[PDB]
Design an enzyme around this catalytic site. Structure first.
Site, PDB file in Angstrom:
ATOM      1  CG  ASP A 131      -1.942   0.581   1.563  1.00 24.01           C
ATOM      2  OD1 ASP A 131      -2.366   0.786   2.722  1.00 24.01           O
ATOM      3  OD2 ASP A 131      -2.491   0.836   0.460  1.00 24.01           O
ATOM      4  N   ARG A 148      17.076  13.286  13.500  1.00 27.60           N
ATOM      5  CA  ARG A 148      18.412  13.930  13.492  1.00 27.60           C
ATOM      6  C   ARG A 148      19.210  13.318  14.642  1.00 27.60           C
ATOM      7  CG  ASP A 199      23.910  17.197   1.324  1.00 27.83           C
ATOM      8  OD1 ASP A 199      24.278  18.190   0.644  1.00 27.83           O
ATOM      9  OD2 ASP A 199      23.170  17.256   2.355  1.00 27.83           O
ATOM     10  CB  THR A 221      16.251  16.354  -0.638  1.00 28.47           C
ATOM     11  OG1 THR A 221      15.901  17.706  -0.170  1.00 28.47           O
ATOM     12  CG2 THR A 221      17.166  16.551  -1.842  1.00 28.47           C
ATOM     13  CG  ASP A 224      21.527  21.640  -2.499  1.00 32.08           C
ATOM     14  OD1 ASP A 224      22.314  21.624  -3.465  1.00 32.08           O
ATOM     15  OD2 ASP A 224      21.688  22.352  -1.481  1.00 32.08           O
ATOM     16  N   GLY A 249       4.116  31.042 -13.996  1.00 33.87           N
ATOM     17  CA  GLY A 249       3.910  32.211 -14.861  1.00 33.87           C
ATOM     18  C   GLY A 249       4.272  33.452 -14.026  1.00 33.87           C
ATOM     19  N   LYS A 266       0.301  45.699 -16.428  1.00 35.14           N
ATOM     20  CA  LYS A 266       0.028  44.598 -15.476  1.00 35.14           C
ATOM     21  C   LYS A 266      -0.620  45.181 -14.210  1.00 35.14           C
TER      22      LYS A 266
END
Lengths: 301, 301
Positions: free
Chosen positions: B60, B73, B104, B126, B130, B186, B214
């Site tokens: 699942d 951590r 990393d 991640t 990076d 956009g 705009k």
């Protein structure tokens, strides 16, 4: 040096054709050109149904599905006499080149206008990914999301009731949509045109999965390979497991383009403008190893 | 030979980590390997908290966000002492290799472990992209979708009221996410850490789009670059246009993985089993010009 260009969509619509027209338009303006939007592919080209496109006219187009200019089937473009009027039209209007967004079919006619000396750039727009010279077609990733959210829903119900589900995916000649969908969806079985398929084999394969304790399964299959209602009945007769087929159909052609399609379409649109400026013609765009590349139309045809 | 592998997730969670764990588990089982799930990344390894994974246990997971094994951590893993205890645990549970999924950060611990005699494979997990040696990390395409969906909603409202909207995207040291989002979105303006930014040039830029017509705009900026409320104040002050900052924050890290991610995570999890069986160790997986490749972890670190 080109002063005014036309843009059109031909073939089955694909999510992102609008982001692509926006790309061409915004680039074209930036570079001081004028853009003419052509209605309904080669048909409106032939009938002289066009519109002048500005910044404002494509301002809300990036997240919109379909093609705002429309698409038609004008097979009659295979005729010299019809292409003749096309050119006359373009000439009367002062259109120097053309961007063509669409499938293999649309490229043919792009080539032909190249020969009668109308520089044309072809952008790949199709949900099946069936275009050579490009890793991906515009619309593919969008259809892949449509197909996978459907599968996710089918998995919920298949699993509630211990049934086998058969989903018919689009891409008549190419197994990409299906295979990708099969993987993303976690489907146990997949049936593509590029592989020797045997009903008998498949059935054995399911029996085996069952016996190990799979209570449900999902079979992904490309359209035009089997009569899915019939395949379903077969499967059910041999396993004794309730099997139902689902044909997603045209929902795969619709919707708001996913981000990959917005980006791909944006990048290819601008790049088509680059090519027109350097004087190219009879070229078709592509994305190869994350790099925009361009090929001779003939190579795609 | 290799009889049992262990699998863990370290660093910030990413959508697709469950698909990766499923790719690993499934491949391993198919090859007769026994799989052990390690809870809370490196913390769990040290504290010997694990679970035997089986088919049913990941059956699942392809469409589920986060990481079922959890991630923590434990910077403490740097200290040799701490890793001896981890080694004591591995040795004891009869784990021959490890498949590590994460940033990393997590790759470091995979180098240490290889050196001490346990072959590790690192999968790039991640949302920010990076990680070196891969075109894309797992979770990136899913975060982009979250961000664009949000940008789409911001455009509806910004539009309605003729406002400038400043949206802060994640990825501290990598502008990849912001850039993709700005294009897919956009967004008229973008601020990434890779480009020198002038608060002033941004205002001219905006003053400009205004006079040119705009009525509204969206500015995508990467986090850790500015105080976005402060910047919105500044823009309001200079243009006289109502400006508001929205910080997407952690919504970026969660949700169901998009197709791309499901696939990516699927292939990489399998491939890691393939590398392990062929004798490799202290390798890190990546996708390059659409092909799976592997590198010395020391080059990615």
């Amino acid at each position: 040096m080109i002063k005014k260009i036309g843009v059109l969509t031909s073939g089955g619509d694909a999510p992102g054709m609008n982001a692509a027209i926006r790309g061409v338009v915004r680039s074209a303006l930036t570079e001081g050109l004028e853009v003419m939007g052509i209605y309904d592919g080669y048909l409106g080209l032939y009938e002289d149904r066009m519109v002048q496109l500005d910044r404002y006219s494509v301002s809300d187009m990036i997240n919109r599905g379909g093609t705002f200019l429309g698409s038609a089937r004008f097979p009659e473009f295979r005729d010299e006499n019809i292409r003749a009027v096309a050119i006359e039209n373009l000439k009367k209007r002062g259109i120097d080149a053309l961007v063509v967004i669409g499938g293999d079919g649309s490229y043919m006619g792009a080539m032909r206008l190249t020969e009668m000396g109308f520089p044309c750039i072809g952008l790949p727009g199709t949900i099946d990914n069936d275009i050579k010279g490009t890793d991906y077609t515009i619309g593919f990733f969008t259809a892949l999301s449509t197909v996978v959210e459907a599968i996710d829903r089918l998995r919920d119900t298949s699993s509630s009731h211990q049934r086998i589900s058969v989903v018919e995916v689009m891409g008549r000649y190419c197994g990409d949509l299906t295979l990708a969908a099969a993987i993303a969806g976690g489907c146990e079985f997949v049936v593509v045109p590029e592989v020797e398929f045997s009903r008998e084999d498949l059935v054995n394969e399911i029996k085996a999965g069952i016996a190990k304790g799979k209570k449900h399964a999902i079979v992904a299959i490309t359209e035009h390979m089997c009569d899915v209602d019939e395949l379903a009945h077969f499967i059910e007769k041999e396993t004794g497991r309730e099997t139902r087929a689902t044909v997603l159909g045209h929902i795969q052609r619709g919707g708001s383009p996913v981000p990959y399609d917005r980006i791909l379409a944006s990048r290819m649109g601008a790049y088509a403008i680059d090519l027109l400026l350097a004087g190219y013609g009879g070229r078709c765009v592509g994305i190869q190893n994350e790099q925009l590349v361009h090929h001779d139309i003939i190579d795609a045809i």
